[PDB]
Design an enzyme around this catalytic site. Structure first.
Site, short mmCIF file in Angstrom:
data_model
loop_
_atom_site.label_atom_id
_atom_site.label_comp_id
_atom_site.label_asym_id
_atom_site.label_seq_id
_atom_site.Cartn_x
_atom_site.Cartn_y
_atom_site.Cartn_z
N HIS B 41 30.05 93.70 22.79
CA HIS B 41 29.29 94.09 21.61
C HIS B 41 29.92 93.54 20.30
O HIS B 41 29.39 93.81 19.22
CB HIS B 41 28.99 95.59 21.55
N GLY B 143 35.68 100.52 14.55
CA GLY B 143 36.66 99.45 14.57
C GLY B 143 37.72 99.60 15.65
O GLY B 143 38.48 98.67 15.88
N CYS B 145 37.07 99.82 18.87
CA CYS B 145 36.61 99.18 20.10
C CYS B 145 37.54 98.07 20.54
O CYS B 145 38.10 97.38 19.70
CB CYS B 145 35.17 98.72 20.01
C1 LIG Z 1 30.18 104.43 14.63
C2 LIG Z 1 31.39 104.70 15.49
C3 LIG Z 1 32.24 105.81 15.17
C4 LIG Z 1 33.28 106.12 15.97
N1 LIG Z 1 33.56 105.37 17.09
C5 LIG Z 1 34.51 105.49 18.05
N2 LIG Z 1 34.39 104.53 18.93
N3 LIG Z 1 33.31 103.74 18.56
C6 LIG Z 1 32.81 104.26 17.45
C7 LIG Z 1 31.71 103.96 16.61
N4 LIG Z 1 30.93 102.85 16.98
C8 LIG Z 1 30.13 102.81 18.08
O1 LIG Z 1 30.20 103.64 18.99
C9 LIG Z 1 29.09 101.69 18.08
C10 LIG Z 1 28.04 101.94 16.94
C11 LIG Z 1 26.63 102.08 17.48
O2 LIG Z 1 26.57 102.78 18.74
C12 LIG Z 1 27.25 102.11 19.71
C13 LIG Z 1 26.63 101.99 20.95
C14 LIG Z 1 27.23 101.25 21.94
C15 LIG Z 1 28.45 100.64 21.69
CL1 LIG Z 1 29.15 99.62 22.91
C16 LIG Z 1 29.08 100.77 20.47
C17 LIG Z 1 28.48 101.52 19.46
#
Ligand SMILES: Cc1ccn2cnnc2c1NC(=O)[C@@H]1CCOc2ccc(Cl)cc21
Ligand SMILES: Cc1ccn2cnnc2c1NC(=O)[C@@H]1CCOc2ccc(Cl)cc21
Lengths: 304, 304
Positions: B41, B143, B145
């Site tokens: 992603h 950030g 990820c």
């Molecule tokens: C916004 C955010 C906040 C805390 N996080 C803690 N870990 N990742 C996040 C996060 N971002 C996401 O989870 C993104 C943003 C949109 O939704 C998805 C869906 C699927 C995937 Cl692979 C990633 C994401």
């Protein structure tokens, strides 16, 4: 989101762990520049610990009696001295992995990471706090002495603790990197009175702010209190008295959440008076006091 | 003595963290040998995440569109490929800090350390478990990820997790290092059903053994039970059913303490039926399930 008892990355400190042996005793040492710091009880045998005269035991030791091993290579000891309860072993080689560092004496209620070590090798890392009674609730087995407590600000490691002892109560006592014990403890195997272990009020409030930020809000109530009224409850529950300095340090968390510090104090007062009623806050069924207000901001903002 | 939620020393993994940028998105990457692993992603913009066709988005990307920075130096990307939900970015330089490593797909109930990272830089390390519903309860902000989960056996790092997502429920989903998600989750911003979060029974019993070893014994009772009787209680309390395999893994802890596994099960049954009655075990007011039987032996024996 999510809130965890997070430790600092331990890489910078792992590069400083060495094994120190003197006679039959082996413990951990901290190699920064051309000096290896370790507890002076490395010169003691199990019998000596009951009543050691460190200066007298040290006279019988020479540079060649301190075996310092960094990984699998031996360091040459060219000098030794005793500063308070630590030994400084001057070696002929500067640690090539020495990070930027400082030696700091922390206040009670301050948190830090511990890199638990055995034979100069790291076993694990965990976050803990200096209790108001100057003990730490660690996880230390025999041979863990010399393991260090530290904090990291960007690239500078602030070493604040060196492990020396386990009290018969199962709690831990140690020194700063100048060898001065935190609290009234001595490096002797004798009965040592750990005082009342009070709860670090400013950290509990900081953790309540972390819970609000991360979504757990059930404990928020319709009440407020005053610092003096709150402190009457805090005294009853063996909590540290909250001062205007603590209210000021909680300013940024109060600002971010929009919950006044005294309003959060009234939520805390109700939690102390009524308990959790079978509920949890940030996965805990008790009020957590090992996150300072700085830790909450750091974790909630992602400081690297 | 003392028992802590201890993480593995993170040094070996910090030497592998890099920053990966593609277009406007920046996340973490894992550099082992001449390959950088990161979530696919990274090629998505916030709009793409609602319904991404990864293969179609990848066609529009070339090696020069993946910016890989290790500290302050730029890595040359000489190849790219998509394996399940991860991208493998082949670089022209082998990571000189690559430790001995393996990629392992862990089972639910297994624990691991997470080195939370932002922009390729480490922020902290904590211990967690793969929940039976294939989610982890982490501490991850935007950030984070590409941050990885791992275990260490002497000098070999077994990477088991790569962070990809936060569900709207605040829990985290990710993949193994081959890019296969743990559980039914997909790398899409859509409603994703996390199932029942059951308690990891074998870990709670292992933690009860750790408490006995470290001195907390109040919960030990005069009773015993059978696996089938215990499991009726475990079902009622959303605990995983205990099997003969779990009893066998608890063998060494049962041996050290002299408390039969089924006797410890009866202590657990009473704790489930009656609660803690305002008491604590190893500083917790709830039954902890994030220590495997191997973690308890490791911590209680000081494995480095
Ligand atoms: C916004 C955010 C906040 C805390 N996080 C803690 N870990 N990742 C996040 C996060 N971002 C996401 O989870 C993104 C943003 C949109 O939704 C998805 C869906 C699927 C995937 Cl692979 C990633 C994401
Ligand atoms: C035996 C043991 C067990 C767990 N530990 C966790 N940390 N250190 C220990 C430990 N060893 C000690 O605390 C020794 C042994 C005798 O008592 C003293 C008194 C003073 C000092 Cl400086 C050290 C020690």
């Amino acid at each position: 989101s999510g809130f965890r008892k997070m430790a600092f990355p331990s890489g910078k400190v792992e590069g400083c762990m060495v094994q120190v042996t003197c006679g039959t005793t082996t413990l951990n040492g901290l190699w920064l520049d051309d000096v290896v710091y370790c507890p002076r009880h490395v010169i003691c045998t199990s019998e000596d610990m009951l009543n050691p005269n460190y200066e007298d035991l040290l006279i019988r030791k020479s540079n060649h009696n301190f075996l310092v091993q960094a990984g699998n290579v031996q360091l040459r000891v060219i000098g030794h001295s005793m500063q308070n309860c630590v030994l400084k072993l001057k070696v002929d080689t500067a640690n090539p992995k020495t990070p930027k560092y400082k030696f700091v004496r922390i206040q009670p209620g301050q948190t830090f990471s511990v890199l638990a070590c055995y034979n100069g090798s790291p076993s694990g890392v965990y976050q803990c706090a200096m209790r108001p009674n100057f003990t730490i609730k660690g996880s230390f087995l025999n041979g863990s002495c010399g393991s260090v407590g530290f904090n990291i600000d960007y690239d500078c490691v602030s070493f604040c603790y060196m492990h020396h002892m386990e009290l018969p109560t199962g709690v831990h006592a140690g020194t700063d990197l100048e060898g001065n014990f935190y609290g009234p403890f001595v490096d002797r195997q004798t009965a040592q009175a750990a005082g009342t272990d009070t709860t670090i009020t400013v950290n509990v409030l900081a953790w309540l702010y972390a819970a609000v930020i991360n979504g757990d809000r059930w404990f928020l109530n319709r009440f407020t209190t005053t610092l003096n009224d709150f402190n009457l409850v805090a005294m009853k529950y063996n909590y540290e008295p909250l001062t205007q300095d603590h209210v000021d340090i909680l300013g940024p968390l109060s600002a971010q959440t929009g919950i006044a510090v005294l309003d959060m104090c009234a939520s805390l007062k109700e939690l102390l008076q009524n308990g959790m009623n079978g509920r949890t806050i940030l996965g805990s069924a008790l009020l957590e006091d090992e996150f300072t207000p700085f830790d909450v901001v750091r974790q909630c903002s992602g400081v690297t």
